[PDB]
Swiss-Prot record:
Known function: Acts as an epigenetic regulator of myogenesis in cooperation with DPF3a (isoform 2 of DPF3/BAF45C). Associates with the BAF complex via its interaction with DPF3a and HDGFL2-DPF3a activate myogenic genes by increasing chromatin accessibility through recruitment of SMARCA4/BRG1/BAF190A (ATPase subunit of the BAF complex) to myogenic gene promoters. Promotes the repair of DNA double-strand breaks (DSBs) through the homologous recombination pathway by facilitating the recruitment of the DNA endonuclease RBBP8 to the DSBs.
Biological source species: Homo sapiens (Human)
Disulphides: none
Protein name: Hepatoma-derived growth factor-related protein 2
Compartment(s) where it occurs, according to its Swiss-Prot or TrEMBL record: Nucleus; Cytoplasm
Subunit structure, as described in the record: Interacts with HDGF. Interacts with trimethylated 'Lys-36' of histone H3 (H3K36me3). Interacts with trimethylated 'Lys-79' of histone H3 (H3K79me3), but has higher affinity for H3K36me3. Interacts with IWS1. Interacts with H2AX, POGZ, RBBP8 and CBX1. Interacts with histones H3K9me3, H3K27me3 and H3K36me2. Interacts with DPF3a (isoform 2 of DPF3/BAF45C). Interacts with SMARCA4/BRG1/BAF190A, SMARCC1/BAF155 and SMARCD1/BAF60A in a DPF3a-dependent manner.
Family the UniProt entry places it in: Belongs to the HDGF family.
Tissue: Widely expressed. High expression is found in heart, skeletal muscle, ovary and testis. Overexpression is frequently observed in hepatocellular carcinoma samples.
Domain called PWWP: residue spans: 7-64
Portion of the full-length sequence here: 1 to 93 of 671
């Protein structure tokens, strides 16, 4: 039964103008910028960009991969598909 989102959870994250994108709930490093209240730091695979999102835009990866996990022409998307499937918890800095 679902819990709240926690660092390390794998998701598809929805941003305006982008398809649902392979992503993870990031950790917040010591001394790093914290997200606004009720928002999570979302690390987008492939592009390696971060955005702050609420749960309305976060879809669990295992439940939605058959819907959202197909190749896409957008820059970084297919690289992101490889990352979320093959090394989702690695450091991509
Ligand atoms: Br959606 C997506 C995939 N990679 N990066 C993004 C993104 C776009 C804009 N602001 C933050 C993150």
């Amino acid at each position: 039964m679902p819990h709240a989102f926690k660092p390390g959870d794998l998701v598809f994250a929805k941003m305006k103008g982008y398809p649902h994108w392979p992503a993870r709930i990031d950790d917040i490093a010591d001394g790093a910028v914290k997200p606004p209240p009720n928002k999570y730091p979302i690390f987008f695979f492939g592009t390696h960009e971060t955005a702050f999102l609420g749960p309305k835009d976060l879809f669990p990866y295992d439940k939605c991969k058959d819907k959202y996990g197909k190749p896409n022409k957008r820059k970084g998307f297919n690289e992101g598909l490889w990352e979320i499937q093959n090394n989702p918890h690695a450091s991509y800095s």
